[PDB]
Amino acid sequence: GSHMTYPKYLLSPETIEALRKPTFDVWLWEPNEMLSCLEHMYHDLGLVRDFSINPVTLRRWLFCVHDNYRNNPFHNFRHCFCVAQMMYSMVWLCSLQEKFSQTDILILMTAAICHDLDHPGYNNTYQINARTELAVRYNDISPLENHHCAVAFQILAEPECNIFSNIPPDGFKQIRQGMITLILATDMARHAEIMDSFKEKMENFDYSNEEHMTLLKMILIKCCDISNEVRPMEVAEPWVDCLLEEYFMQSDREKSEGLPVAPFMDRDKVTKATAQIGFIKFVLIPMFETVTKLFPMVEEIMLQPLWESRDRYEELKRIDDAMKELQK
Numbered sequence: 001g002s003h004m005t006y007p008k009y010l011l012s013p014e015t016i017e018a019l020r021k022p023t024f025d026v027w028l029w030e031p032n033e034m035l036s037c038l039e040h041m042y043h044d045l046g047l048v049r050d051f052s053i054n055p056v057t058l059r060r061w062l063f064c065v066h067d068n069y070r071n072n073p074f075h076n077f078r079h080c081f082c083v084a085q086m087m088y089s090m091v092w093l094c095s096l097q098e099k100f101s102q103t104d105i106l107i108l109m110t111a112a113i114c115h116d117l118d119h120p121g122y123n124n125t126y127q128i129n130a131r132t133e134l135a136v137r138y139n140d141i142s143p144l145e146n147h148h149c150a151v152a153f154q155i156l157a158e159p160e161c162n163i164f165s166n167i168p169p170d171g172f173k174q175i176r177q178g179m180i181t182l183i184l185a186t187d188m189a190r191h192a193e194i195m196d197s198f199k200e201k202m203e204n205f206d207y208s209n210e211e212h213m214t215l216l217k218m219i220l221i222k223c224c225d226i227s228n229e230v231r232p233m234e235v236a237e238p239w240v241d242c243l244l245e246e247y248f249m250q251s252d253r254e255k256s257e258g259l260p261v262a263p264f265m266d267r268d269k270v271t272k273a274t275a276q277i278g279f280i281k282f283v284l285i286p287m288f289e290t291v292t293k294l295f296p297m298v299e300e301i302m303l304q305p306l307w308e309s310r311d312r313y314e315e316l317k318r319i320d321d322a323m324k325e326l327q328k
Ligand SMILES: Nc1nc2c(ncn2[C@@H]2O[C@@H]3COP(=O)(O)O[C@H]3[C@H]2O)c(=O)[nH]1
Pocket: 116, 186, 188, 225, 226, 227, 228, 229, 240, 243, 275, 276, 279
């Protein structure tokens, strides 16, 4: 309803409102628009207010985080924007502010933004098997994730980027610990371990028990990370071709360098459909089923799109298969 046009990085009222929901079209926007969005999130969640974040530093820091993501097909700035924007969505969808402190929100949000810093676009198995410098550096223990985390704090140690410069040190120590746990929790090698620890607490969940809360925070960041398929089908789908783009780059290389190839990155055997049916049925549906025991509104906003996406890929596979029966 506006009297004149604004530049793009002046988000409109429509965009700001849309940003609260997981229907948001994470493809519409260029990096500067995404930066303004992340910025708005910090103000709107009251984090600028409650941690005295100098607002120019907030901007400088985000631009700096941006600079430290690489131009990978999948593990890129736009992916961290998805993860952060889904977390933002979740704060509203689950009323996380009723249950969590502002320090906990700061952790969730900053860990979402930082959780894949400087990802080289080849996973931990490649690093370990190739004996990369990262694998040697981190002794084969969640090397990518430990690195993302280290880069996060290197950025924050530069004073012009230090969004925590006005938090007292006890606060800093606490945010740092949370963020480390959360970013490390994103390594999928630990998925069943973390899911088991959570389910065990979920036998008698207790919002006043820090250990219960830490596990909830780890499940929350894990949901957000692997949440592409929760989004509308037109927004979700292009991500799968990016993921395969990386997975196939890795397996080419592995083949070429004599290293073990994983069959789920095997060009000859893998399909969008075959990639997503299992990942939806046996990773995403069940994780969100348990979150849903705490947050039942999660069913309708997030389990439904997943059921729909599983059903669609199942159809797709039926036709892809028909189609390779014209071949070979
Ligand atoms: N098959 C499939 N795997 C995914 C999908 N989304 C995330 N993953 C995997 O989950 C991993 C989680 O952390 P990263 O974001 O470091 O790398 C991710 C992918 O390997 C998806 O939509 N489909």
